[PDB]
PDB file of all heavy atoms in Angstrom:
ATOM      1  N   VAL A   3       2.365   4.279  -1.991  1.00  0.00           N
ATOM      2  CA  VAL A   3       1.905   5.100  -3.115  1.00  0.00           C
ATOM      3  C   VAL A   3       3.109   5.808  -3.767  1.00  0.00           C
ATOM      4  O   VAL A   3       3.807   6.596  -3.139  1.00  0.00           O
ATOM      5  CB  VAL A   3       0.870   6.152  -2.661  1.00  0.00           C
ATOM      6  CG1 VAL A   3       0.169   6.731  -3.870  1.00  0.00           C
ATOM      7  CG2 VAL A   3      -0.107   5.540  -1.672  1.00  0.00           C
ATOM      8  N   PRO A   8       8.840  15.176 -11.055  1.00  0.00           N
ATOM      9  CA  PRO A   8       8.950  15.453 -12.514  1.00  0.00           C
ATOM     10  C   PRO A   8       9.852  14.422 -13.153  1.00  0.00           C
ATOM     11  O   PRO A   8      10.551  13.708 -12.430  1.00  0.00           O
ATOM     12  CB  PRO A   8       9.622  16.797 -12.558  1.00  0.00           C
ATOM     13  CG  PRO A   8      10.183  17.088 -11.186  1.00  0.00           C
ATOM     14  CD  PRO A   8       9.333  16.286 -10.211  1.00  0.00           C
ATOM     15  N   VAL A  26      32.847  23.364 -23.249  1.00  0.00           N
ATOM     16  CA  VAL A  26      33.927  22.520 -23.701  1.00  0.00           C
ATOM     17  C   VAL A  26      35.198  23.279 -24.045  1.00  0.00           C
ATOM     18  O   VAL A  26      36.273  22.955 -23.651  1.00  0.00           O
ATOM     19  CB  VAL A  26      33.511  21.665 -24.947  1.00  0.00           C
ATOM     20  CG1 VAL A  26      34.710  20.975 -25.562  1.00  0.00           C
ATOM     21  CG2 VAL A  26      32.419  20.705 -24.586  1.00  0.00           C
ATOM     22  N   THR A  35      44.450  17.716 -20.568  1.00  0.00           N
ATOM     23  CA  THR A  35      44.612  16.283 -20.462  1.00  0.00           C
ATOM     24  C   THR A  35      43.338  15.573 -20.077  1.00  0.00           C
ATOM     25  O   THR A  35      43.337  14.360 -19.957  1.00  0.00           O
ATOM     26  CB  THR A  35      45.675  15.895 -19.415  1.00  0.00           C
ATOM     27  OG1 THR A  35      45.237  16.286 -18.107  1.00  0.00           O
ATOM     28  CG2 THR A  35      47.007  16.596 -19.688  1.00  0.00           C
ATOM     29  N   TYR A  44      19.903   5.703 -17.596  1.00  0.00           N
ATOM     30  CA  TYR A  44      18.874   5.400 -18.575  1.00  0.00           C
ATOM     31  C   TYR A  44      17.430   5.788 -18.053  1.00  0.00           C
ATOM     32  O   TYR A  44      17.060   5.399 -16.894  1.00  0.00           O
ATOM     33  CB  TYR A  44      18.945   3.911 -18.914  1.00  0.00           C
ATOM     34  CG  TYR A  44      17.748   3.380 -19.623  1.00  0.00           C
ATOM     35  CD1 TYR A  44      17.358   3.923 -20.871  1.00  0.00           C
ATOM     36  CD2 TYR A  44      17.041   2.297 -19.073  1.00  0.00           C
ATOM     37  CE1 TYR A  44      16.217   3.422 -21.562  1.00  0.00           C
ATOM     38  CE2 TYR A  44      15.935   1.787 -19.771  1.00  0.00           C
ATOM     39  CZ  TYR A  44      15.535   2.331 -21.005  1.00  0.00           C
ATOM     40  OH  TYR A  44      14.476   1.843 -21.680  1.00  0.00           O
ATOM     41  N   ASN A  65      41.280   3.817 -20.042  1.00  0.00           N
ATOM     42  CA  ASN A  65      40.534   3.150 -21.062  1.00  0.00           C
ATOM     43  C   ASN A  65      39.071   2.923 -20.657  1.00  0.00           C
ATOM     44  O   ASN A  65      38.732   3.042 -19.453  1.00  0.00           O
ATOM     45  CB  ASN A  65      41.204   1.853 -21.526  1.00  0.00           C
ATOM     46  CG  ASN A  65      41.031   0.741 -20.529  1.00  0.00           C
ATOM     47  OD1 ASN A  65      39.923   0.383 -20.094  1.00  0.00           O
ATOM     48  ND2 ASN A  65      42.174   0.188 -20.163  1.00  0.00           N
ATOM     49  N   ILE A  70      34.359   2.188 -16.933  1.00  0.00           N
ATOM     50  CA  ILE A  70      33.269   1.386 -16.397  1.00  0.00           C
ATOM     51  C   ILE A  70      33.398   1.059 -14.945  1.00  0.00           C
ATOM     52  O   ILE A  70      32.421   1.161 -14.214  1.00  0.00           O
ATOM     53  CB  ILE A  70      33.186   0.128 -17.157  1.00  0.00           C
ATOM     54  CG1 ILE A  70      32.492   0.373 -18.523  1.00  0.00           C
ATOM     55  CG2 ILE A  70      32.432  -0.870 -16.329  1.00  0.00           C
ATOM     56  CD1 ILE A  70      32.426  -0.890 -19.377  1.00  0.00           C
ATOM     57  N   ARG A  75      32.257   1.884  -9.222  1.00  0.00           N
ATOM     58  CA  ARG A  75      32.745   2.186  -7.897  1.00  0.00           C
ATOM     59  C   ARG A  75      32.060   3.431  -7.326  1.00  0.00           C
ATOM     60  O   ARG A  75      31.559   3.410  -6.214  1.00  0.00           O
ATOM     61  CB  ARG A  75      34.251   2.204  -7.774  1.00  0.00           C
ATOM     62  CG  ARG A  75      34.793   0.814  -7.405  1.00  0.00           C
ATOM     63  CD  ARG A  75      36.315   0.671  -7.396  1.00  0.00           C
ATOM     64  NE  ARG A  75      36.959   1.473  -8.431  1.00  0.00           N
ATOM     65  CZ  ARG A  75      37.563   0.997  -9.548  1.00  0.00           C
ATOM     66  NH1 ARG A  75      37.618  -0.307  -9.812  1.00  0.00           N
ATOM     67  NH2 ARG A  75      38.187   1.873 -10.364  1.00  0.00           N
ATOM     68  N   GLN A  78      28.696   2.758  -6.047  1.00  0.00           N
ATOM     69  CA  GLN A  78      28.767   1.822  -4.918  1.00  0.00           C
ATOM     70  C   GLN A  78      28.131   0.448  -5.180  1.00  0.00           C
ATOM     71  O   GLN A  78      27.534  -0.116  -4.279  1.00  0.00           O
ATOM     72  CB  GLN A  78      28.210   2.473  -3.666  1.00  0.00           C
ATOM     73  CG  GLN A  78      29.345   2.886  -2.754  1.00  0.00           C
ATOM     74  CD  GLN A  78      29.042   4.107  -1.878  1.00  0.00           C
ATOM     75  OE1 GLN A  78      29.325   5.237  -2.251  1.00  0.00           O
ATOM     76  NE2 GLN A  78      28.424   3.892  -0.690  1.00  0.00           N
ATOM     77  N   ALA A  84      24.373  -6.074 -12.611  1.00  0.00           N
ATOM     78  CA  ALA A  84      24.504  -5.924 -14.075  1.00  0.00           C
ATOM     79  C   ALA A  84      24.619  -4.465 -14.428  1.00  0.00           C
ATOM     80  O   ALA A  84      23.876  -3.630 -13.875  1.00  0.00           O
ATOM     81  CB  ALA A  84      23.292  -6.554 -14.774  1.00  0.00           C
ATOM     82  N   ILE A 101      40.363   6.509 -23.817  1.00  0.00           N
ATOM     83  CA  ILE A 101      39.253   7.461 -23.935  1.00  0.00           C
ATOM     84  C   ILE A 101      39.512   8.658 -24.829  1.00  0.00           C
ATOM     85  O   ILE A 101      38.587   9.385 -25.180  1.00  0.00           O
ATOM     86  CB  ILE A 101      38.804   7.948 -22.557  1.00  0.00           C
ATOM     87  CG1 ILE A 101      37.451   8.673 -22.736  1.00  0.00           C
ATOM     88  CG2 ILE A 101      39.883   8.887 -21.948  1.00  0.00           C
ATOM     89  CD1 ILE A 101      36.655   8.875 -21.486  1.00  0.00           C
ATOM     90  N   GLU A 106      37.343  11.259 -29.761  1.00  0.00           N
ATOM     91  CA  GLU A 106      37.499  11.837 -31.120  1.00  0.00           C
ATOM     92  C   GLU A 106      36.600  11.165 -32.096  1.00  0.00           C
ATOM     93  O   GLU A 106      36.100  11.862 -32.994  1.00  0.00           O
ATOM     94  CB  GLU A 106      38.924  11.794 -31.642  1.00  0.00           C
ATOM     95  CG  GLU A 106      39.856  12.743 -30.926  1.00  0.00           C
ATOM     96  CD  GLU A 106      39.536  14.208 -31.122  1.00  0.00           C
ATOM     97  OE1 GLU A 106      38.788  14.528 -32.109  1.00  0.00           O
ATOM     98  OE2 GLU A 106      39.959  15.046 -30.287  1.00  0.00           O
ATOM     99  N   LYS A 109      32.337  11.918 -29.882  1.00  0.00           N
ATOM    100  CA  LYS A 109      31.856  13.112 -29.216  1.00  0.00           C
ATOM    101  C   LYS A 109      30.799  13.793 -30.073  1.00  0.00           C
ATOM    102  O   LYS A 109      30.883  13.778 -31.302  1.00  0.00           O
ATOM    103  CB  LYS A 109      32.986  14.086 -29.000  1.00  0.00           C
ATOM    104  CG  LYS A 109      33.332  14.845 -30.257  1.00  0.00           C
ATOM    105  CD  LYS A 109      34.685  15.444 -30.206  1.00  0.00           C
ATOM    106  CE  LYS A 109      35.193  15.580 -31.650  1.00  0.00           C
ATOM    107  NZ  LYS A 109      36.133  16.745 -31.582  1.00  0.00           N
ATOM    108  N   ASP A 110      29.856  14.373 -29.386  1.00  0.00           N
ATOM    109  CA  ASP A 110      28.793  15.166 -30.013  1.00  0.00           C
ATOM    110  C   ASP A 110      29.346  16.425 -30.579  1.00  0.00           C
ATOM    111  O   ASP A 110      30.447  16.882 -30.200  1.00  0.00           O
ATOM    112  CB  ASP A 110      27.651  15.463 -29.065  1.00  0.00           C
ATOM    113  CG  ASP A 110      26.600  14.318 -29.050  1.00  0.00           C
ATOM    114  OD1 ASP A 110      27.014  13.117 -29.209  1.00  0.00           O
ATOM    115  OD2 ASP A 110      25.428  14.699 -28.912  1.00  0.00           O
ATOM    116  N   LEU A 115      31.311  14.187 -24.825  1.00  0.00           N
ATOM    117  CA  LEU A 115      31.069  12.767 -25.077  1.00  0.00           C
ATOM    118  C   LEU A 115      29.951  12.273 -24.190  1.00  0.00           C
ATOM    119  O   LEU A 115      30.076  12.374 -22.941  1.00  0.00           O
ATOM    120  CB  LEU A 115      32.305  11.993 -24.786  1.00  0.00           C
ATOM    121  CG  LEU A 115      32.208  10.450 -24.894  1.00  0.00           C
ATOM    122  CD1 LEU A 115      31.937   9.944 -26.299  1.00  0.00           C
ATOM    123  CD2 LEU A 115      33.580   9.893 -24.453  1.00  0.00           C
ATOM    124  N   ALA A 120      23.109   1.542 -17.811  1.00  0.00           N
ATOM    125  CA  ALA A 120      21.854   0.835 -17.559  1.00  0.00           C
ATOM    126  C   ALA A 120      22.221  -0.586 -17.072  1.00  0.00           C
ATOM    127  O   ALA A 120      23.390  -1.019 -17.148  1.00  0.00           O
ATOM    128  CB  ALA A 120      21.081   0.739 -18.774  1.00  0.00           C
TER     129      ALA A 120
END
Side-chain angles (χ1 to χ4, degrees):
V3 196
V26 170
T35 68
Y44 166 59
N65 75 55
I70 281 178
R75 269 174 325 251
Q78 258 150 266
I101 194 162
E106 289 295 341
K109 77 199 154 153
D110 272 35
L115 174 64

